[PDB]
Amino acid sequence: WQSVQNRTFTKWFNTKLSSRDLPSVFDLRKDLSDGILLIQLLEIIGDENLGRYNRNPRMRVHRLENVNKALEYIKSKGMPLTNIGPADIVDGNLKLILGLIWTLILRFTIADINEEGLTAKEGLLLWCQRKTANYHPEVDVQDFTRSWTNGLAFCALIHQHRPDLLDYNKLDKKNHRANMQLAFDIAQKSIGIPRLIEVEDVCDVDRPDERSIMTYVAEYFHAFSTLDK
Ligand SMILES: [Zn+2]
Ligand SMILES: [Zn+2]
Ligand SMILES: [Zn+2]
């Protein structure tokens, strides 16, 4: 069994790796232990060549070397590695691994988001608010949790960007699950937005995972913005 955040972060990681036909992550407890996929991820999201590393790290010393290379790169970019060391990754500390991946999502997916001079999380929230301004009172984006669980904010974002793809006014606003599914399907099929979260992970969830939602909503910002150039 894997948590929403585990699954969402794994899917995010894989969208990056697949951009270079690299092998996927299936289990974050085990699949980062030799340091290779972490290094490759960093090259991809960081747009840099990290140079040579151990490509057959059969011995523990070489896995630690690989992971240490990754962590040093992350530190060199000014990201906090609060209370994580190479052995935490080699030995599959899932809590610390998810923490690290969030640090990377925040830096490489969210930090550069900008709306009205606000950046990062604030910027992304404000973008959502501005883009859904015409959908009050039923849509009211106030956070990256409860504001998203009825499906309508996702549908409104799609509709305002491409009113030909999703007829918002024809939705049965009470069918949260059908509307969520519709948005996720249209986003993926027509807008190229990867399905980082399952409908059941957010639809009518009392305490949805904030970081997972943020990770997925950031895909809307980047795709919409790029497509609107
Ligand atoms: Zn747009
Ligand atoms: Zn509650
Ligand atoms: Zn969270």
Residue numbers in the entry: 6 to 234
Paper text:
α-actinin, a ubiquitous actin cross-linking and bundling protein, belongs to the spectrin superfamily. This group of proteins is characterized by a highly conserved N-terminal actin-binding domain, a central rod domain consisting of spectrin-like repeats and a calmodulin-like domain at the C-terminal (Blanchard, Ohanian & Critchley, 1989; Otey & Carpen, 2004; Sjöblom, Salmazo & Djinovic-Carugo, 2008). As α-actinin forms antiparallel homodimers, it can cross-link actin filaments, thereby contributing to the three-dimensional organization of the actin cytoskeleton.
Each domain consists of four long helices A1, C1, E1, G1 and A2, C2, E2 and G2 respectively. The structure was solved in the closed conformation where the interactions between the CH1 and CH2 domains are mainly caused by helices A1 and G1 (CH1 domain) and helix G2 and the coiled region between helices E2 and G2 (CH2 domain). The hydrogen bonding pattern between CH1 and CH2 is very much conserved when comparing S. pombe ABD with other ABDs. Further, there is a π-cation interaction between two residues from G1 and G2. In the S. pombe protein this interaction occurs between the conserved Trp107 and Arg216. In addition, there is a salt bridge present between helix A1 in CH1 and the loop between E2 and G2 in CH2 in the S. pombe protein; a strong bidentate hydrogen bond interaction between Arg12 and Asp206 (hydrogen bond distances: 2.9 and 3.1 Å, respectively). Taken together, the strength of the π-cation bond between Trp107 and Arg216 and the interaction between Arg12 and Asp206 indicate strong interactions between CH1 and CH2 and may favor a closed conformation of the actin-binding domain. Three metal ions are found in the crystal structure and they are modelled as zinc due to the high concentration of zinc in the crystallization conditions.
